């Protein structure tokens, strides 16, 4: 439990998780891609909407 050192009043510094990865990820690997992902059919990944 590290609550007395990480937590600060009025929000904290951003800590992120990924919502989706396309393929099964092989052991000991990570994705740091910050590219804008899209769920619908309409094109994105370079367009914000």
């Amino acid at each position, epitope marked *: 439990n590290s609550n*007395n050192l990480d937590s*600060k*009043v009025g929000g904290n510094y951003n800590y992120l998780y990924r919502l989706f990865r396309k393929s099964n990820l092989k052991p000991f690997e990570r994705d740091i891609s910050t590219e804008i992902y899209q769920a619908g059919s309409t094109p994105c990944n370079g367009v914000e909407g």
Partner: antibody
Amino acid sequence: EVQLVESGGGLVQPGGSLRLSCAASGFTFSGYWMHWVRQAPGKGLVWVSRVNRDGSDADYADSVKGRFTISKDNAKNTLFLQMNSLRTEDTAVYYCVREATTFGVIIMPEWYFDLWGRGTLVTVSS
Amino acid sequence: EIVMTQSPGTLSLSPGERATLSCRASQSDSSNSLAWYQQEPGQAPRLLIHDASSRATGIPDRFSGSGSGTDFTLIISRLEPEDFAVYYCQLYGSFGQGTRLEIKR
């Protein structure tokens, strides 16, 4: 004995900059978490700022946000705080205070203050 | 965000007879991490208890109070002529308004 000497402060024009020092004698100014507290004249005290052991991360309240910057100088043994655009309501007395840590297998601060040094009066008026 | 109300505002009691002080938080439970601070108006604040259960060394054994979760109560076993001070309460992020302990006459 364990004591913190507060230096700086005084008269300052509104919109100006001010800068405070806090030298720590009697204990190790390396691992203990540091806090800065203000107290308005004839009013209650509110929390100002917090800094950890290394000094990368800092914690500021909304009123002091964007104007106050705290820095812990472990090697030089001093707690520092720089203000700019000091508003009129900031006229108060400033205390440099410590935050307790067990210093066990983890530092693990507790967010309670141990010793309060004598604070300095900062007055800003036209 | 978090607001502490110390009730009541003025506690006027005779020097001989005891006193108690109750502080009311606003929301949530902070693992019972709370502290009391006694402030003689000319002097600086000083801690009385830490973690709301244990009492810091040097503080007189009279000062002993405890609570859990919702409301935090701090009981003073007897009374001596030093309670001319404002008693504040320091939570995770904010300080309470405080209470003032007067002498009856």
